[PDB]
A paper describes a structure:
The co-crystal was obtained by the soaking method. MMβA-mono occupied a wide region of the cavity, including Tyr77, Val78, Asp94, Ser112, Tyr114, Thr115, Glu167, Thr199, and Asp70. The replacement of each Arg of MMβA-mono with Ala resulted in a marked reduction in A-subunit binding.
Shiga toxin (Stx) is a major virulence factor of enterohemorrhagic Escherichia coli, which causes bloody diarrhea, hemorrhagic colitis, and sometimes fatal systemic complications, such as acute encephalopathy and hemolytic-uremic syndrome. The catalytic A-subunit is an RNA N-glycosidase that cleaves a specific adenine from 28S ribosomal RNA to inhibit eukaryotic protein synthesis. The B-subunit pentamer is responsible for high-affinity binding of Stx to the functional cell surface receptor, Gb3 (Galα-Galβ-Glcβ-ceramide).
Author numbering:
A (entry chain D), E (entry chain C), F (entry chain F): 1 to 70
B (entry chain G): 6 to 10
C (entry chain A): 1 to 241, 257 to 297
D (entry chain E), G (entry chain B): 1 to 69
């Protein structure tokens, strides 16, 4: 499902080494190491990101994300 | 917030 | 205040835009040549608007003359449109703070985001065509529109009219490219990806250009200016740096090798760790 | 050969560990993690990228790409 | 606990490969390698960060940090 | 020896995971992965780079490069 | 000891995969790979760096450095 599409409101490095972003008022975490700098770059530049996951409640995990210029 | 027209 | 944007000729159109800019904004000291500048919107209280009467869709004729746009002054957003024949203001859902006396206000369910408008219009701005003929069609669609929820054709009309009014006020590049469609040849303006990217970077540009002091170039995300004539040929009016001025952090610029960078852009490609460690650490 | 030249319209990391970029209206993907920061940096700075392949094809993989300011 | 919220006043790469930041007048170190470039870019742009740790005295360690848009 | 000094005219990721740059009209490639984002940053910002190698023919390899600002 | 404090005058990736910086007229090298992007970032954005080490003779190694805007 497309869970959220919006700008990153905050990001957080977690104690278990996963990485959280808040998008559309909901928090999503990922364990994909490759995504940590990419998500911070999106936050820094105000990219619209699309979080895709099988559950969309706040606190769900994701491994797929789109980085848009608009 | 995404760009408004 | 009320202004007219007259589409009769390229002269009338550019003169209209220049008059609006002179009234609502003040030139930057360091990006100004003659009376052509990058200007900063003068502060006004939140909710202040100006009206734009659309004229000249049929060259120099007093017809197709019942459309007015309501523009929030501090950010140049179109808040909605007025049918002056029916005295009705159709107002986007993100502008409930804009009140226009003397009209019937229809508060719409539709918000003014380009994402929403492009979805309802089934029309992407990248590659969108605008001609005098399609502006007449847009006008007729807006005059036929009724109700609280934008239709496809009303949304296409708003996409076209916002591009050639508010976005042209912001960006001399869009003014220059579109105005060719007003000539007797009646060619077609095609909005390019670069045009679209300019509109999407307006707030970021607005935060950076007040710091310009004659550096050899300016870099803001995907946008590059290599000299003052590139700046002036592209940008006309910027925000007074408004929430759109800041994404994160508090540093507008970094000067790197006599180029003024948006600090956020540099930060976003300098936040990489050692490449071998990145790629092996799966 | 040169498959596509232009700025990056969007990028996406997929659940199957591929990284897609859209360039000049066509989507291409790579599984080289080295290219993820390079491509995303190219995206956010507006570099012109040239995707190169032995066999150019929409929806096909790549691992050769030129970067120009 | 949320120990310190503010801009990074300086950062420091340490001989044991940990990484120190000073936030709200107190120094905090982390052994999370991935935080090194993320913190430096936050520092560069004046990003507000929140250091989270079990102890908040200057000299404490952390493995959790939030990157804010303030 | 100093093979080439100037700004990076283009860079290129290669199918064998090497990385090519063109400097002062000559092309050089490196197998050192750490140089890939560093050279990209240099290219983006107009650094003057000096390619250093014992073979300076165009199309040759390198693993030493100096980075200078204006 | 504070070996050197100032702006990075140049940086250099070396054939042995170490990384050299020149600060306040003196050259120092480090073998720590994650310092390579951290130092190049500092060089590009004009940070003041403070090289800290047991020995501070020109051409010596280091693995501690402070970064200030």
């Amino acid at each position: 499902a497309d869970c959220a599409k919006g700008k990153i409101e905050f990001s957080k490095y977690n104690e278990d080494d996963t990485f959280t972003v808040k998008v559309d008022g909901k928090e999503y975490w990922t364990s994909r190491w490759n995504l940590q700098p990419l998500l911070q770059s999106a936050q820094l530049t105000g990219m619209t990101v699309t979080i895709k996951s099988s559950t969309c409640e706040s606190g769900s995990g994701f491994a797929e994300v789109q980085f848009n210029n608009d | 917030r995404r760009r408004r027209a | 205040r009320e202004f007219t944007i007259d589409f009769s000729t390229q002269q009338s159109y550019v003169s209209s835009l220049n008059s609006i800019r002179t009234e609502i904004s003040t030139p930057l000291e360091h990006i100004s040549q003659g009376t052509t500048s990058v200007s900063v919107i003068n502060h006004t209280p939140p909710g202040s608007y100006f009206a734009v009467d659309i004229r000249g869709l049929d060259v120099y004729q007093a017809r197709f003359d019942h459309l007015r746009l309501i523009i929030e002054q501090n950010n140049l957003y179109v808040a909605g449109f007025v049918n002056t024949a029916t005295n009705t203001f159709y107002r986007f859902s993100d502008f409930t703070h804009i009140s226009v006396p003397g009209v019937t206000t229809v508060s719409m369910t539709t918000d003014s985001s380009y994402t929403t408008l492009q979805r309802v219009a089934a029309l992407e701005r990248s590659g969108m065509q605008i001609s005098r003929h399609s502006l007449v069609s847009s006008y007729l669609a807006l005059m036929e529109f009724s109700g609280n929820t934008m239709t496809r054709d009303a949304s296409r009309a708003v996409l076209r009219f916002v591009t050639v009014t508010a976005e042209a006020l912001r960006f001399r590049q869009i003014q220059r490219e579109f105005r060719q469609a007003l000539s007797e040849t009646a060619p077609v303006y095609t909005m390019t990806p670069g045009d679209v990217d300019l509109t999407l970077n307006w707030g970021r540009i607005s935060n950076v250009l007040p710091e310009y002091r004659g550096e050899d170039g300016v870099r803001v995300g995907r946008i590059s200016f290599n000299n003052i004539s590139a700046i002036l040929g592209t940008v006309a009016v910027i925000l007074n740096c408004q929430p759109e001025c800041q994404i994160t952090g508090d540093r507008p610029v970094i000067k790197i090798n006599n180029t003024l960078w948006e600090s956020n852009t540099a930060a976003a490609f300098l936040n990489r760790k050692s490449q071998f460690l990145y790629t092996t650490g799966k």
